[PDB]
Amino acid sequence: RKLAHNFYKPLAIGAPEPIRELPVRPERVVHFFPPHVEKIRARIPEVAKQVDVLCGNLEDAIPMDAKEAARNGFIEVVKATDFGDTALWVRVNALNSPWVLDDIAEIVAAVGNKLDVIMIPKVEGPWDIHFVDQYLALLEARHQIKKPILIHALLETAQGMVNLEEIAGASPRMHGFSLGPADLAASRGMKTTRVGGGHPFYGVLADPAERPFYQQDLWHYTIARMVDVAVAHGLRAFYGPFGDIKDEAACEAQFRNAFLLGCTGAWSLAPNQIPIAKRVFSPDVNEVLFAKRILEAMPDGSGVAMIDGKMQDDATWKQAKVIVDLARMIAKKDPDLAQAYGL
Amino acid sequence: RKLAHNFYKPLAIGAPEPIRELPVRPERVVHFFPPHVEKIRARIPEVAKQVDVLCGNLEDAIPMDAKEAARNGFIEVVKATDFGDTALWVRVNALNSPWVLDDIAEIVAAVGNKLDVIMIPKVEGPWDIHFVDQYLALLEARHQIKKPILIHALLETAQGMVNLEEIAGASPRMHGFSLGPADLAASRGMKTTRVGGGHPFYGVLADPERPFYQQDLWHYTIARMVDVAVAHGLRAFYGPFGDIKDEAACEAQFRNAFLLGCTGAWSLAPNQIPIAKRVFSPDVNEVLFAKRILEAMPDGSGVAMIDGKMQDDATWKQAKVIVDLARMIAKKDPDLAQAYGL
Amino acid sequence: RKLAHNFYKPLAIGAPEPIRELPVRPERVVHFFPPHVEKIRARIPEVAKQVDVLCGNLEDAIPMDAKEAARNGFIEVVKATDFGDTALWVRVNALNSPWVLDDIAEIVAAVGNKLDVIMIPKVEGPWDIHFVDQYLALLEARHQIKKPILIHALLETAQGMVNLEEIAGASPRMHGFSLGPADLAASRGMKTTRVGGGHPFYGVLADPERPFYQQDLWHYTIARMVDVAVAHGLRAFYGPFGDIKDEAACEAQFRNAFLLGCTGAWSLAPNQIPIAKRVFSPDVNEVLFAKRILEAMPDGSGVAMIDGKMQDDATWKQAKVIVDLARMIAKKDPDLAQAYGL
Amino acid sequence: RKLAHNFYKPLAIGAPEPIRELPVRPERVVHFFPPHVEKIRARIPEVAKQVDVLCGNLEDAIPMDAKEAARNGFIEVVKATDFGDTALWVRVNALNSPWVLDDIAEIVAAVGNKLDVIMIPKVEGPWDIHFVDQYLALLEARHQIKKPILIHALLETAQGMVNLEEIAGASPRMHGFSLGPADLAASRGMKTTRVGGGHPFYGVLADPRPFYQQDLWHYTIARMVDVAVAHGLRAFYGPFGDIKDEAACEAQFRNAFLLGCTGAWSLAPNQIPIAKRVFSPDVNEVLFAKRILEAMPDGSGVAMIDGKMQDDATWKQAKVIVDLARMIAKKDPDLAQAYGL
Amino acid sequence: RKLAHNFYKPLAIGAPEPIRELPVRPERVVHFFPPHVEKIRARIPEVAKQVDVLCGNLEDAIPMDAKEAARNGFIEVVKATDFGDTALWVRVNALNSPWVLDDIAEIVAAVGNKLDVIMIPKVEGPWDIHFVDQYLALLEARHQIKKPILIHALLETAQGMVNLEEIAGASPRMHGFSLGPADLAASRGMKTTRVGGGHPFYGVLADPAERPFYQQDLWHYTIARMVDVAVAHGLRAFYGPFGDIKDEAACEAQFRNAFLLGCTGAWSLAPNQIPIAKRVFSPDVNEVLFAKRILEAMPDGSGVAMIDGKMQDDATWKQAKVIVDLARMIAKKDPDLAQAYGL
């Protein structure tokens, strides 16, 4: 628990000033891609135009022999690509791995000024954050990175869920969390199906034709807790990978459940999940219109105002301010939503 | 959190001795009324006889040009009304609002001896409780209030849910928590259809037509609220249900709270009044069992075993609570009086 | 918490060295038996062969006038029986009862080397663990117990759930947790139709006859229990299911706990024995995947990758546990032996 | 720490109700004695009249073959002695020792209604207190002890000094702390020439040479007092080993007293009057407190004495120091007139 | 402790923005005066010209029948006086007294825009700070106070010393601490012969004519602990009152002991203590001359510099900046120190 007057200081001389609040931009879909596959690298400038954020993958589904080819491939394609409004993330290897050191160092050195958020696997405590925060700062100051590279934590273990508060407030670099269904289920010892997301035998048997069996959601406690901790710290919650690429119905349903609980976006591991994520995690229409009324009653966000019998202040205003700014950005690339939002 | 030998001490010279445990009384329904409306104000003495708890509202749905009127209005009825066995609460404005200072100060000064619980909107940390505690204490001393005015925390933000333990044990004034569904959903970013309800699209899709089983949005919230509240000797409450017209959903939602361990719920309309009282009335067989406990242990001392279960002091005090509670309800409900035998 | 270098030191001179990790063995079923009953006592050596864990009961459903005969009767049967591969547990009385002192002391004194785990009722805080840990150490050093006796915490209060993390990391004696549904629901104010069951009136009403989707009362509880236990290297157990004859609902409830990460459940009758064993037997596909991890990394060192997932120390020793557990079960079950390939 | 509404409840059924405040009584001197020595046991009924607190010792300086004799001898003399106004303490063996179980269990069983305070050696954390608290409660309930036996923590390790706040607020049984100089110095690696004393070579050298000796125990005692007082506990100076050096003994006792310590141990009859003389309540403080008790008849309302507002916390301490002075006045005629009680 | 992103927010709509760093100004002497006394009240414009800080007293040594007179007297003299460079404090009554509410409310209402710091007696925990913080914010918003009024905690109990960390980080209003010797000694059970002084009989007796008796300082632990907690949280530590007015020798020695341990200033209960405090707690000439070179080496305050073998960063530059500003302000009032400092 750092002191407030030390929390927002750069951890290295020449490192960029830590952020006071998260950058507002579309993050409905976190599209993953293997940077070592040449065919994939070829289409990256085209796919970048269809997604909110594009994320390079050096960890899972990346063979041990391809680790360096992935890192170099990532650096290669990023140097050549103008991502424009699409954000750039990268998931490096775990902190105990023999690749993570070169992963962060070589990438920040080469394409640090294009990198927005870095994803760290298997974050189990604030000590993990402390290392990465200090490590990035020294790398940022070294190569004159102009904007602080944010930290996205991947929740994969039982300990991670327990230490969620301490992780959330360990650094001003914190961006948010991603629920890793397959990894977390393996850690906890959950028996799920279809690489994480449910099990048809988890339900309630009714009292006595045949007794009704009402399936229940295995991930209620997990997401609910993830949202509360994240929101309280001004961070965003995300549903991670939905491994069952072919079941688009279960995918959209699972994505929707996350959205209804307060999640910002989800991962896509294939071209068919891109439109699903962008559709589900798009800001509610009525919610956008309501926030426009709030911004109109309060030009500065100063003073006291009441809308629909509800007192307004700086908190509700900044909040209305982010969702309108967000919706406007989405409207800029979606004529159909530009009409529905009036933005 | 304060030291044990300082926790139950008055925060002001003249302030009444803090309570050691919650006053036992019916709290199945907390009826909200707008004190600035003379028409509604005039019916208060008769409504009070219909509800367990009556709560004046100065906050939401009370216009900014009517705050002073709502405040002065509330003082007016309370001065002129004898509430009898009905508890008197009031929901003042937010701690950052330009109304809260005069709200608490003037109401305590005028009717502090009739006010039981004050409800604080948007409690997010123990620092909120600490302010209200010290502020009330100085006010109680100035006007010689005989009973300590308790504090009810309204949960409306994510931080409030996370800091629930710190809030619960921040003061001996703590009464309990009310879930503010609409406000909490807005804070978290929950997508919900109507206040107090859930969402039709939250559910589990069955494996490869595929059935769709709706889920409860508020399960985690109520469960955590109950656990924290009970552990600190407080009481958990379900807040407002915005759909007055839909009584079936209202009873179903109130029942979900009751089954998880909530004490009562809010009522915004007269049709919600009998619903809350019916749902949150103490379980009959549970009451009947506590009567055996109180009898096996008249003094409440020594060791006793009922149905193979050992009875210590903790279970006895719990049994004393529900039996007394059931009796105060049986006092004005001939049917429950029959079932309880009280 | 204690410092790391002190955490694994014995609390008494002559007390066995504290374990660094849980002893791996079948714990799918915890069969309870009243040691004061003679006809039950006689059939014990036979019942022991049919269960993974046999637990003597001195607490609930044991009359106060039979407490001593239960304690003595337990010592008698344990003395004359070689339980073999069956784990031996005992549930003593509550830490505030007038029996617990003689319970722990006399049992450890006589059969301490045959006792594996002691179940403590109503653990509410780390202080409870601290007493038993220090108490046991003094008793172990006195009678030269070679194996450290582990503590199994019974969760029966809301405060216990709130302090679950402090309880989990209070001692290396910690084995795991078991839910006490009848008590935990009483403490919370939860309404259940069965001990360890749910409630048919708890569910989501659909928007406009309106269908009613039942929900699980225990989702929050089990989920929190699992995360805390697993994080501290402990095992979470479901506990008892009241409705003995509802084997259908018994299996479903046991299954839900298993799917969430619970190691096993209690059995209150012979018919619940095969149900618990069937349900909590290690998932076939976890066993298979674990063997691939072990086959890939002989000594557990170095870096490897299975199905795209990097394997480290944590994954390896976790896989070592599963296979060892599956092998111990394969030994006494030919069907699972072929399914596991062990 | 436990929750406030649970903190003051008996930890066993039939156990006496936990105290809310420390019992007010003279504790200027804690006189130790070896209960196994029959010659000492014979004079105890008379020695008790000469000390504020009498504490039997089962731990240090008690041979391993005499541990059982000491425990039985203690029970024997306590049964035979009417202690009157003299407090009865006992220092059992360490919590890891093979004697502590029998020490606490058998003594409480036989003379639990005469035992006021147990001194526990080498208390390092709240866990130590949690065990003793729960263990005592079950023993108290079983033998129907009428008053809760308090716990006095011995500070003998660096860890104990670090976990002071956590040890203090871990139980309502907590009476206070005694400093254990020899063992604490050994734990820290501190160099002292005497048990309870400092070191002549610890000091400040002047600039170009006089050498100004410093007190090694300043930090330790100051920290102990703050933590104890904050929790409503009493801090004590432990044993002073150098029996013959009465000048240095009084100086060490006085240093502790000036910092806020309640009393000190006595390892020999000659230290008994020294502790009394030093740790007797200041006359001026007693007289000023009498003014408070007179100005505020019930302790309510708001008064002001010498330009200082008197609430309830100030009045409660005025009441404590006066009651304490009166009890001492009951057996010291010189202070009876000095205090005016 | 609050989260960093909520820590620096107004606690009320209309309340001024909380400070990020302590205002830099001469605080060597905090001169106490009784506002209920007429002749004192009439010389205030003259005395204020001779002190760094002027603090009105409503608490100790103020009779109960004079509480209202003192409160009104303070308000009247502040309204009529332009204090210029002199800071204005006030010590209201204890938080449990029947005078606190009126003390704070009426003063903020009438002279809130002239009040710099408010001193609270007997601060024992963060909860105390929490009340005053919120109370002030609601009063500041109501009366349009432009600058936030800071909180100065008086240490008078053993509990206060123990909870010193939680107190220091309880609010951005925190200015620092003052040691209250008579009250704290009474709480602890200490014995002193003078208010603020030690005790002759507290010392080390040398080994075996006469055995020498080396006197020891009673307040070493207290001041040392107070300084570490204060400095860590970016606060300032003050000695407080030295009750022995006559003994100027002991007063200066006692003030110096605080100054050598890092205390910013002390109270002056009498006109003869004013020049003593100003002389003692004036910034050391060596620190000013050296800290200037730091600013000289690195003007903007960034980059990597090295002075006398020691690396200079943001932390050291910021501390060097304040010591020169402080010295320059003092230079404006003292031509001797203006010569020594060179400012």
Curated annotation (Swiss-Prot), chain D:
Residues given in the record as substrate binding sites: 31-32, 39, 91, 182-183, 267
Enzyme Commission number(s): 4.1.3.24, 4.1.3.25
Keyword hit for Lyase: yes
InterPro entries: Aldolase/citrate-lyase_domain, Citrate_lyase_beta/mcl1/mcl2, Pyrv/PenolPyrv_kinase-like_dom, Pyrv_kinase-like_dom_sf
Cofactor section: Mg(2+); Mn(2+)
Cofactor annotation comment: Divalent cations such as magnesium or manganese.
Alphabetical UniProt keywords: Carbon dioxide fixation, Lyase, Magnesium, Manganese, Metal-binding
Record GO biological process: carbon fixation by 3-hydroxypropionate cycle; oxaloacetate metabolic process
Binding, Mg(2+): 156, 183
GO molecular function: (S)-citramalyl-CoA lyase activity; L-erythro-3-methylmalyl-CoA lyase activity; magnesium ion binding; malyl-CoA lyase activity; metal ion binding
Catalytic activity: (S)-malyl-CoA = glyoxylate + acetyl-CoA; (2R,3S)-beta-methylmalyl-CoA = propanoyl-CoA + glyoxylate; (3S)-citramalyl-CoA = pyruvate + acetyl-CoA
Record text on subunit structure and interactions: Homohexamer. Dimer of trimers.
Family: Belongs to the HpcH/HpaI aldolase family.
PANTHER family: CITRATE LYASE SUBUNIT BETA, LYASE BETA SUBUNIT, PUTATIVE (AFU_ORTHOLOGUE AFUA_4G13030)-RELATED
Function: Involved in the 3-hydroxypropionate cycle used for autotrophic carbon dioxide fixation, and in the glyoxylate assimilation cycle used to regenerate acetyl-CoA and produce pyruvate as universal precursor for biosynthesis. As a part of the 3-hydroxypropionate cycle, it catalyzes the cleavage of (S)-malyl-CoA to yield acetyl-CoA and glyoxylate. As part of the glyoxylate assimilation cycle, it catalyzes the condensation of glyoxylate with propionyl-CoA to yield (2R,3S)-beta-methylmalyl-CoA, and catalyzes the cleavage of (S)-citramalyl-CoA to yield acetyl-CoA and pyruvate.
UniProt name for this protein: Malyl-CoA/beta-methylmalyl-CoA/citramalyl-CoA lyase
Species of the source: Chloroflexus aurantiacus (strain ATCC 29366 / DSM 635 / J-10-fl)
Taxonomic lineage from the root: Bacteria, Bacillati, Chloroflexota, Chloroflexia, Chloroflexales
